[PDB]
Design a protein around this ligand. Structure first.
Ligand code: FAD
Ligand code: BOG
Ligand code: BOG
Ligand code: BOG
Ligand code: BOG
Length: 499
């Protein structure tokens, strides 16, 4: 009998499970495929506040999101850091005066302790923008490695004594005799599981209503508005460290975000989507849309041929019945119901990456009446697994290379920005490059891949190359198939057992 079972291992499920485990609940988190396999790896990777939501009057959300930025930067310094954003002025769309106030709200809605001011810009004949654009504005927000933020939370669950199972799909949940009985199946081996729990969380993202309908045969409190958004990736469009936020002719904004020193991400789009969330992928008109708003602003033109990767996901969004996808609220709603005072179901509707910690604390607040002697709120003071450094650059990578002098500058940078304070567990007793074992390409060594399987739930090559890391951007097809082969070998046995 678990205290709490959480179904879903995106950001919301992992954040709720972690918060619960740290309040002394016995927790089990179930993830059908891999941690952050769906929406929580398909985001624009921003911890924001949501500048564009001010136009819609979403103060509560914007204020919350803005003040969380500083909390999240402290919790996960290895994977989250400040970024500057440049907004080119387009007075036919929004007048300078409106922007020159919008910016002060964004500055004093949360109360920031550390993120720099906000400034005007002028653009000259030599800038990266087309000459007709002569003015803009620059303000602070944060970038975060979305999929590794979910991983850090799953690690926290385990640290606090909780249990995490991936490749394990919950197939039903029903209330019997005052308890939940939850059934689940291993997606590979068909192994069936059944647990009892005192309380159940439905944090299944795009599937949240479907799990009501198919898993539980209970009425969903809300409908869900699956709104697809896609991103494109190109070799970095300029050498500047700032992101740009572009005002499009439809009133939407599109970002151009530096990524991994080598690339730029451009996105995103707002497309009503119907069908299987697993099948989501970018469409031609999204490519045309994103290249347009980029090419209208920047001198250096991009074509379809420059794109080197794309990705796509579906925002679950609580259905507030808005006619326009870009206007549907991005704020979350939690619903909780019990039967005869027992066996609460808490279901998550919406919930940006940015607000996950607050969402989780709110969830546990709602769950509290059901758990005698449950611990208090705690995560605001916590440091997630990997976060116990002190400046990423900065000097953690410098500090690493000082301890482990066989590390290249590039590899030390990768470990600091990926594993953070867990780098020493990865590197174990290594004292040369050869101690890292097989080189799979782009300084992705056996020591790393083994660590990922042992400590980061990696089961398949995509887990390691696209969620745990983004080494998939560099490894060729042959190298990616060798990673898959190594995993089959390592995970099939000699460590998976018969002891
Ligand atoms: C295009 C795009 C860009 C975005 N950009 C940002 C941004 O810049 N900043 C920000 O803060 N937010 C952003 N978001 C929003 C954010 O990504 C999502 O709100 C967040 O990822 C929601 O995650 P979730 O945990 O609720 O859903 P998920 O955890 O992603 O989905 C449910 C997960 O649980 C598992 N699961 C589902 N059903 C079952 C079941 N039956 N049994 C067992 N397991 C199951 C799945 O495999 C799935 O991965 C963006 C969203 C989109 C779509
Ligand atoms: C009647 C409502 C008018 C006031 C609108 C609130 C101003 C904030 O509005 C925001 O301003 C930003 C720049 O600061 C823009 O980039 C965003 O797209 C816009 O949503
Ligand atoms: C002159 C327009 C060139 C486009 C580059 C941005 C400079 C716009 O500068 C001006 O901003 C003011 C308030 O919005 C107003 O004087 C005008 O609407 C606008 O032209
Ligand atoms: C610093 C913001 C003060 C708050 C009041 C906003 C008034 C808008 O200040 C802006 O100044 C520009 C000249 O620099 C003009 O081009 C714009 O027309 C004007 O609206
Ligand atoms: C006295 C200080 C002014 C505060 C700004 C109040 C916000 C509403 O301001 C109004 O918004 C309209 C719709 O966007 C605009 O068309 C109007 O020009 C503007 O005056």
């Amino acid at each position: 009998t678990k205290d709490l079972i959480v179904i879903g291992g995106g950001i919301n499920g992992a954040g709720i499970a972690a918060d619960a485990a740290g309040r002394g609940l016995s927790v089990l988190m179930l993830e059908a495929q891999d941690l952050a396999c769906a929406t929580s790896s398909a985001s624009s990777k921003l911890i924001h506040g949501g500048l564009r939501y001010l136009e819609h009057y979403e103060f509560r959300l914007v204020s919350e999101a803005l003040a969380e930025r500083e909390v999240l930067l402290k919790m996960a310094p290895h994977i989250a850091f400040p970024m500057r954003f440049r907004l080119p002025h387009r007075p036919h769309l929004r007048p300078a005066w409106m922007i020159r106030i919008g910016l002060f709200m964004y500055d004093h809605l949360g109360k920031r302790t550390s993120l720099p001011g906000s400034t005007g810009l002028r653009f000259g004949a030599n800038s990266v923008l087309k000459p007709e654009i002569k003015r803009g504005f620059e303000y602070s927000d944060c970038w975060v490695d979305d999929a590794r933020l979910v991983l850090a939370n799953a690690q926290m669950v385990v640290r606090k004594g909780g249990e995490v199972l991936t490749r394990t799909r919950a197939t039903s949940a029903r209330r019997e005799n005052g308890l939940w009985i939850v059934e689940a199946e291993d997606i590979d081996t068909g192994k069936k599981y059944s647990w009892q729990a005192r309380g159940l969380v439905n944090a299944t993202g795009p599937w949240v209503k479907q799990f009501f309908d198919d898993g539980m045969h209970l009425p969903s409190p809300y409908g869900i508005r699956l709104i697809k958004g896609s991103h494109i990736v190109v070799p970095r469009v300029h050498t500047q460290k700032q992101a740009y936020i572009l005002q499009n002719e439809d009133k939407r904004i599109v970002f151009v975000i530096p990524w991994m020193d080598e690339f730029s991400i451009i996105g995103t789009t707002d497309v009503e989507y119907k069908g299987d969330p697993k099948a989501v992928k970018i469409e031609e008109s999204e490519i045309n849309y994103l290249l347009n708003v980029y090419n209208t602003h920047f001198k250096k033109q991009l074509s379809r041929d420059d794109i080197v990767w794309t990705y796509s996901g579906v925002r679950p969004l609580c259905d507030d019945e808005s006619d326009s996808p870009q206007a549907i609220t991005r704020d979350y709603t939690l619903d909780i119901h019990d039967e005869n005072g027992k066996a609460p179901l808490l279901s998550v509707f919406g919930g940006k990456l940015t607000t996950y910690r607050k969402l989780a604390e709110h969830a546990l607040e709602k769950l509290t009446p059901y758990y005698q002697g449950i611990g208090p709120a705690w995560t605001k003071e916590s440091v997630l697994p990997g976060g116990a450094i002190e400046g990423d650059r900065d000097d953690y990578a410098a500090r690493l290379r000082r301890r482990y002098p066989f590390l290249t500058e590039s590899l030390a940078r990768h470990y600091a920005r990926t594993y953070g304070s867990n780098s020493e567990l990865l590197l174990g007793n290594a004292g040369t490059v050869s101690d890292l074992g097989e080189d799979f390409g782009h300084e992705f060594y056996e020591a790393e891949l083994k660590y990922l399987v042992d400590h980061e739930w990696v089961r398949r090559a995509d887990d390691a190359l696209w969620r745990r890391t983004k080494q998939g951007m560099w490894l060729n097809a042959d190298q990616q198939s060798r990673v898959s082969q190594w995993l089959v070998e390592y995970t099939q046995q000699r460590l998976s057992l018969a002891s």
